[PDB]
């Protein structure tokens, strides 16, 4: 039984693949531009992935890996009335590049289900792109498409830490993504049956992608303060979670 | 950091304690004294707990423990229109016997707030009382008493497998409780910040407290398929978060 | 797969089974008695076990558990030329009482093969008994007897920390025991095949046993400063090998 | 504290840095070359390192990591009269390329102390080499030289699995290595203090390195069947060996 595990509490540039604006300053993973004044910049795009690829399904054995991630992220907008665009946890082909700038989160191209990009994402959306987005701020599960397969309402607590837990099991295939805001004592959850064999290639890079506005004044920070991940691929023909969550939060 | 953990996928009496009306047999944890036919009996009080007491907060350093738990439970009633009452993931004192049955869920004596009780539990309510309860079916936390302050909405599933995740964080005192239906997708979550140094004592028996009503018309069951738990007691003024990504994979995944 | 683990970087009473002279003093498991002036006492016997019975083999499936323990102990003798008798990690029946003191270490009655004792022990022996002992300080594997089935040489450093690791890989049926004195850069290792199915019962108590000498001059402390444990019992297949790597970091540091 | 772990009970090319003759064959790491029919080739060298760099020590804080690695290997020589050379678990610089083959195990160049190497290794040596080696088969601790600063005896059994555990306790500076031949009940151990802040860079790649004999007769299989590892680096300011040696090594 193959295992892979890491937990962050402070970040480093060395054990990550950093694309575009993604920078590590003062131990924090800043996926988008943050100037030498403390101001978020619009038009910024960035990607951060773990240096070691992960096997999420095996063809010759037929088994799918069961994984889980947990990260504390902070979105700080000077104007909560004009924010864009958000951040997402993603699984993408090992050396795959970011795509469209802004509301596409540097992950997808269009609203259609296109498995040439082979990208599963869990988005945290703070802007109404409308044609594919629901009314307000939302957590969405993305499958080859920026038009989320399922979405849940999100009371976006600006400038406040957001603690996420995303879990995938092999017997249930239910990709579950939750978010808590301890300062506002709130909690939200998304759950949909996703199958990784059909969508993602055998080996992927896990990590993050975040963007800012296509406008001039649509600015926010998109920081990750900590990150845990663990995966287990069963050999021949459930996983332990409880022990995973504390590993980072606790 | 003092650690304690375990993962049940097949239960045993040898590593479980019983109180009042509990029973452990046949590959699963049937907390209510179930007859051969499958009959829920009213006027009961099931109490299954792990043998080791689990430390919540230290005196010598003054550090709170962060814990996590995951279990797969079912609430089954032959009549859906009359369900009472359900169970609650209890953290009761070791040197304390179960209390009043029914609405009090075998945990408390009175509806009023009293620190003498020393019991925090995550309920999976089914019956409408209202004197200490909200509007309908609810998943909530019980602090020092049976009367809640904030709960969540939850549709009452009948004869459905549900996987539960409950966690506590020392840094923010936040107790987060979730519940997922693999088949129905009906996933719900609740969170609330309550200080446990003021409420709970130092050592508690952790497990499942089950109960029924005072009438045969309102009857239901209490069953657990698999159980997991972890706890972490921080050393010297940490106020940090425990790992959770690796935990849920131990039991559930 | 059923699992059970704990890490005691500091000790407490409520999760242990203390027998005879074993006490928890200021976070330390002081197994044998010490005077209010810091003076070790002769004719002492002490036992401390984990409050949860640990299943090391299943009868209904024929599967054997894989388990691992680590602990740091410290044997502080007023004089090095007169020490006795040592301490041991042992697996014993759930309700087992302390046996003979001294050279028997509270675990055994004789040097002959006593199958009814049902005890596997890893001894850290600081007294040459001759009736069974090798000539110098030694680690031994004890199967239903104080006459060790195998031994190795232990260059014991008086009053210095001993870092111990004991693993049992069920598939190979091999028990391996190692001791490290980090102050002197010394290391020792013992390994021998032991079949748990015919020696030990299904459920066991896991912990410690220690004694001082039977003469007033031959005295020592037998303290355990920290103790971590892990066990993984499979469902139907014989077993899967345990992950030792992440153990110490999460257990011993 | 930051944590990093993995368990390889079955190997893959995707999460390893393969160098020279080392390759994954049927889910096993064959470090030196071996024919389809089983016979190993002479004069070979192989290396395998994990994809993500591991932080052993931190410059500004002074804080040093505690790590533990467990692996099972199999050394099978067609003839016990002519075996060479051996395998080692080593920590090297990030962009480290293989050095001198044969007796130097692909980790060193000369018998003298050279700092430019920045390499800490645990050798398992089956050939009595020249100006460095002790009289019999031996485990060794290699600190910037093929001449081990401390060795212990190792009764090697041809073609029998060897279970290895290596640990580093930061607070005592102690590196401990153990080898067990479970098939014949034998066990071996060595321990020596090593200052890794003097020797190793802040970031190191961990893994293996093995060589076959520089003469045509001196052949052996240099196989690694499983490999588990974990590291723990604190934030400000010991590892549970119980759980590790299992979850990973079982
Ligand atoms: O206000 C900022 C927005 O600008 C829009 O043109 C774009 O569709 C969005 O993705 C967002 O960037
Ligand atoms: O409908 C039965 C009810 O009986 C009441 O006396 C009791 O307080 C309730 O908890 C409920 O069980
Ligand atoms: O001098 C102390 C010794 O006394 C003997 O009677 C006993 O058998 C030894 O184990 C040791 O205790
Ligand atoms: O004959 C085999 C030997 O050949 C030597 O020249 C070499 O130094 C050794 O490493 C060993 O390979
Ligand atoms: N990802 C997840 N978030 C919240 N609760 C869960 N229970 C199981 N998986 C979960
Ligand atoms: N117990 C819990 N269930 C679901 N999501 C969580 N996030 C943090 N704790 C959680
Ligand atoms: N207990 C143990 N000590 C040393 N090396 C080992 N290899 C496997 N188990 C071991
Ligand atoms: N690597 C190791 N091998 C054997 N015993 C140990 N005790 C601590 N570390 C050890
Ligand atoms: Ca959007
Ligand atoms: Ca009620
Ligand atoms: Ca003796
Ligand atoms: Ca050599
Ligand atoms: Mn969206
Ligand atoms: Mn209620
Ligand atoms: Mn002896
Ligand atoms: Mn050598």
CATH code where residue B135 lies: 2.60.120.200
HEC string of D148-216? Answer: CCEEEECCCCCCCCEEEEEEEECCCCEEEEEEEECCCCEEEEEEEECCHHHHCCCEEEEEEEEEECCCC
The reply to whether A3 touches chain C by the CB within 8 Å rule is yes
Give me B49's structure tokens: 């707990």
Nearest CA to ligand 1 atom 10: A103
CA–CA separation, A5 and D37 (whole Å):
36
Tally of structural domains, chain B: 1
Helix (H, G, I), strand (E, B) or coil at D41: coil
Buried b (16+ CB within 10 A) or exposed e, D50-84: bbbbbbbbbeeeebbbbbbbbbbbbbbbbeeebbb
Ligand 1 neighbours, Cβ below 6 Å, are A 84-85, 102-103, 127, 129, 213-215, 218
Beta-carbon neighbour count of residue D214 at 10 Å?
Answer: 15
Resolution of this structure in Å? 2.0
Query: Quick one: CA dihedral A92, A97, A99, A104, positive or negative?
Result: positive
The tokens 């075998």 sit on which residue?
B106
**What phi and psi, each to the nearest 5 degrees, are found at residue C69?**
-135, 145
**Are C227 and C28 contacting, i.e. CB atoms less than 8 angstroms apart?**
no
CA–CA separation, D189 and C189 (whole Å):
6
ω before C85 within 30° of 0 (cis)? yes
**Are C107 and C207 contacting, i.e. CB atoms less than 8 angstroms apart?**
no
CA–CA separation, D250 and D239 (whole Å):
17
Q: Give chain C's count of helices (H) and strands (E).
A: 2, 18
Question: Half-sphere exposure (CA, 13 Å, Cβ side) for D13?
Answer: 8
CA–CA separation, B229 and C129 (whole Å):
45
Give me B146's structure tokens: 């049976």
In this structure, the dihedral spanned by the alpha carbons of residues A49, A54, A59 and A65, taken in order and rounded to 10 degrees, is -110
**What phi and psi, each to the nearest 5 degrees, are found at residue C50?**
-80, 135
Distance from CA of C199 to the nearest CA of B (A): 20
How far is CA D105 from each of CA B116, D117, D196, rounded to the nearest angstrom?
A: 69, 13, 21
The reply to whether D90 touches chain C by the CB within 8 Å rule is no
Distance D138 CA to ligand 16 centre (A): 7
The reply to whether D82 touches chain A by the CB within 8 Å rule is no
Nearest to B58, CA basis, from B240, B234, B199:
B234
User: What method did the depositors use to determine the structure?
Assistant: X-ray
CA–CA separation, A29 and C120 (whole Å):
51
**What phi and psi, each to the nearest 5 degrees, are found at residue D7?**
-130, 115
**What phi and psi, each to the nearest 5 degrees, are found at residue B178?**
-125, 165
CA–CA separation, B1 and B22 (whole Å):
33
Chains touching chain C through at least 3 C-beta pairs below 8 angstroms are: A, B, D
CA–CA separation, C215 and C209 (whole Å):
19
CA–CA separation, D214 and C48 (whole Å):
57
A56: left (phi over 0), alpha (psi -120 to 50) or beta: alpha
**Are B97 and B90 contacting, i.e. CB atoms less than 8 angstroms apart?**
no
Domain that holds residue A8: 1-250
Exposed/middle/buried for residue A131 (C-beta within 10 Å: 0-12, 13-18, 19+): exposed
Distance from CA of A128 to the nearest CA of D (A): 37
**Are D230 and D57 contacting, i.e. CB atoms less than 8 angstroms apart?**
no
**Are A179 and A124 contacting, i.e. CB atoms less than 8 angstroms apart?**
yes
The distance from CA A226 to its chain's CA centroid, rounded to whole angstroms, is 13
DSSP letter at D139? E
**Are C21 and C33 contacting, i.e. CB atoms less than 8 angstroms apart?**
yes
How far is CA D66 from each of CA A228, C72, C181, C226, D69, rounded to the nearest angstrom?
A: 19, 17, 17, 18, 11
**Are A125 and A136 contacting, i.e. CB atoms less than 8 angstroms apart?**
no
Give me A73's structure tokens: 């992220």
CA–CA separation, B250 and B230 (whole Å):
10
First-to-last alpha carbon distance for chain D, in angstroms, is 24
Distance A143 CA to ligand 9 centre (A): 15
Under 8 Å CB-to-CB from A67, ≥6 apart: which residues? A54, A56, A167, A168, A229, A230, A231, A232, A239, B249, B253
Question: How is A178-241 classified by DSSP, letter by letter?
Answer: EEEETTTTEEEEEEEE--HHHHS-SEEEEEEEEEE-SSSS-----EEEEEEEEEEE------EE
Helix (H, G, I), strand (E, B) or coil at C215: coil
Q: Which residues of D touch A231 (CB under 8 A)?
A: none
E strand intervals along chain C: 2-8, 16-20, 23-25, 28-30, 45-50, 54-55, 66-74, 85-93, 120-125, 138-143, 150-153, 161-169, 174-181, 186-193, 203-212, 223-233, 243-244, 251-252
Residue in chain A closest to C4 (alpha carbons) equals A243
């Amino acid at each position: 039984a193959n295992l892979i595990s890491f937990t962050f509490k402070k970040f480093n540039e060395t054990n990550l693949i950093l694309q575009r604006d993604a920078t590590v300053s003062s131990g924090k993973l800043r996926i988008t531009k943050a100037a030498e004044n403390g101001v978020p910049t619009a038009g910024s795009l960035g990607r951060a992935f773990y240096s070691t690829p992960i096997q999420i399904w095996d063809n010759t054995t037929g088994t799918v890996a069961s994984w889980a991630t947990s990260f504390t992220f902070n979105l700080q907008a000077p104007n909560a009335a004009s924010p864009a665009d958000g951040l997402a946890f993603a699984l993408v082909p090992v050396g795959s590049q970011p795509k469209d700038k802004g509301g596409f989160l540097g992950l997808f191209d269009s609203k259609n289900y296109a498995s040439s990009n082979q990208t599963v994402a869990v988005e945290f959306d703070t802007f109404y792109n409308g044609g594919w987005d629901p009314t307000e701020r939302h957590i969405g599960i993305d499958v080859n498409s920026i038009k989320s397969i399922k979405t849940t309402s999100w009371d976006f607590a600006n400038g406040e830490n957001a603690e996420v837990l995303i879990t995938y099991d092999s017997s249930t295939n239910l990709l579950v993504a939750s978010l808590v805001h301890p300062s506002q004592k709130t909690s939200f959850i998304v759950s949909e049956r996703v199958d990784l064999t059909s969508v993602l290639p055998e080996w992927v890079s896990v990590g993050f992608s975040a963007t800012t506005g296509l406008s001039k004044g649509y600015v926010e920070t998109n920081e990750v303060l900590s990150w845990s991940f663990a995966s287990k691929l069963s050999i021949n023909k459930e996983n332990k979670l409880a022990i995973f969550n504390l590993e980072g939060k606790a």
